[PDB]
Amino acid sequence: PFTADKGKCGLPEIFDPPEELERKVWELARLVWQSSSVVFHTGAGISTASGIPDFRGPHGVWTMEERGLAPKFDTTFESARPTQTHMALVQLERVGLLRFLVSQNVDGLHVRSGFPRDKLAELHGNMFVEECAKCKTQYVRDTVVGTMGLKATGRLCTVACRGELRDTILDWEDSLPDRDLALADEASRNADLSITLGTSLQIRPSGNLPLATKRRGGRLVIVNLQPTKHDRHADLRIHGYVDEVMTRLMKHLGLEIPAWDGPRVLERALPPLPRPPTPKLE
Numbered sequence: 001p002f003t004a005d006k007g008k009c010g011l012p013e014i015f016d017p018p019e020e021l022e023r024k025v026w027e028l029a030r031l032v033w034q035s036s037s038v039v040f041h042t043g044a045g046i047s048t049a050s051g052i053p054d055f056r057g058p059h060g061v062w063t064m065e066e067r068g069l070a071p072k073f074d075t076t077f078e079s080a081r082p083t084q085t086h087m088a089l090v091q092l093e094r095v096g097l098l099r100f101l102v103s104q105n106v107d108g109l110h111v112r113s114g115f116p117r118d119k120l121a122e123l124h125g126n127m128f129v130e131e132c133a134k135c136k137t138q139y140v141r142d143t144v145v146g147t148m149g150l151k152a153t154g155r156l157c158t159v160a161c162r163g164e165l166r167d168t169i170l171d172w173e174d175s176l177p178d179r180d181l182a183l184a185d186e187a188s189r190n191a192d193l194s195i196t197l198g199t200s201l202q203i204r205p206s207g208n209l210p211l212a213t214k215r216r217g218g219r220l221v222i223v224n225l226q227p228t229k230h231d232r233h234a235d236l237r238i239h240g241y242v243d244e245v246m247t248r249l250m251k252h253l254g255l256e257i258p259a260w261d262g263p264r265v266l267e268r269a270l271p272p273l274p275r276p277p278t279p280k281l282e
């Protein structure tokens with residue numbers, strides 16, 4: 001915790017100017033339309049626009065710590081609303097254009113946005129989710145579970161059990177959950193397009209998964225304000241706010257960003273909804 005390498009923190013942000021931002025967002029569209037299999041990888045930068053600071057941005061938790069400053073939250077985790085980005089991902093999966101979702105965030109927003117838990121991998125855990133150490137059943141709570149580092153919460157299992165309930169928050173020592181990791185790994189290997197949103201790609205193995213898509217010749221897109229660890233492996237790099245990138249993309253795809261009903265848990269992905277027909281791309 002004290003010794004832990006927190007990577008490169010506080011690097012400068014890059015702003016594509018607007019004509020270049022438009023041409024790159026069109027090309028991202030172009031790639032989504034030609035792909036058989038898209039996998040989105042997310043990090044802390046998709047939740048900054050709902051009041052949650054990131055780790056390594058100019059005012060992220062590790063950056064500010066290095067300067068002797070505190071990070072600032074403009075919300076509780078319980079009151080946080082999902083961003084436009086979160087909601088765009090909800091809709092892309094409902095229309096069959098997202099195959100699988102890989103995230104490093106523990107903030108619980110992808111589940112609460114209504115995104116299906118069977119197309120989602122929560123690599124670093126989920127602050128609302130506690131797990132039965134005996135039977136492995138998970139409970140998705142309406143408030144954050146008070147502990148981190150896979151400790152006992154003090155509640156017991158209700159399954160038709162009495163096993164000890166534990167948070168799912170990984171500590172620096174802890175290895176990733178295997179279901180989640182193997183699923184994310186399988187998805188990344190078979191993907192023909194991996195799109196990274198608000199991650200600096202510095203944590204392993206979480207940050208390496210998108211590179212798997214490069215094997216067998218897949219394409220890789222990074223959307224990020226700062227430089228990331230794998231910027232030179234990318235076919236397209238977009239330097240912009242993710243909400244502005246996601247909303248323009250959705251408009252090119254002819255899709256609405258749907259309304260959030262408030263906190264909801266969906267275990268299993270629903271049957272695919274109709275979607276616009278695809279443009280002819282020479």
Ligand SMILES: Nc1ncnc2c1ncn2[C@@H]1O[C@H](COP(=O)(O)OP(=O)(O)OC[C@H]2O[C@H](O)[C@H](O)[C@@H]2O)[C@@H](O)[C@H]1O
Pocket residue numbers: 013042043044045046048049054055056057060104105106124197198199200201202203223224225226227240241242243
């Ligand atoms: N609105 C935005 N639009 C685009 N990019 C953004 C925005 N806001 C922030 N960024 C970018 O968002 C990036 C966020 O990167 P980082 O802070 O390293 O977070 P991670 O999720 O990769 O952290 C990985 C793990 O490491 C930790 O120990 C925890 O274990 C995490 O689970 C920055 O470069 C910003 O420029």
Ligand SMILES: O=S(=O)(c1cccc(C(F)(F)F)c1)N1c2ccccc2-n2cccc2[C@H]1c1cccnc1
Pocket residue numbers: 001002044052053054061106107127148169
């Ligand atoms: O910075 S933290 O307090 C934190 C967590 C674990 C370990 C440390 C350490 F540096 F002290 F080791 C700090 N912090 C945190 C704060 C409250 C609840 C949970 C977390 N949390 C868990 C993993 C990473 C963070 C992280 C975080 C998560 C999402 C958005 N913003 C920050």
Ligand SMILES: [Zn+2]
Pocket residue numbers: 132133134135136137157158159161162163
């Ligand atoms: Zn149990």
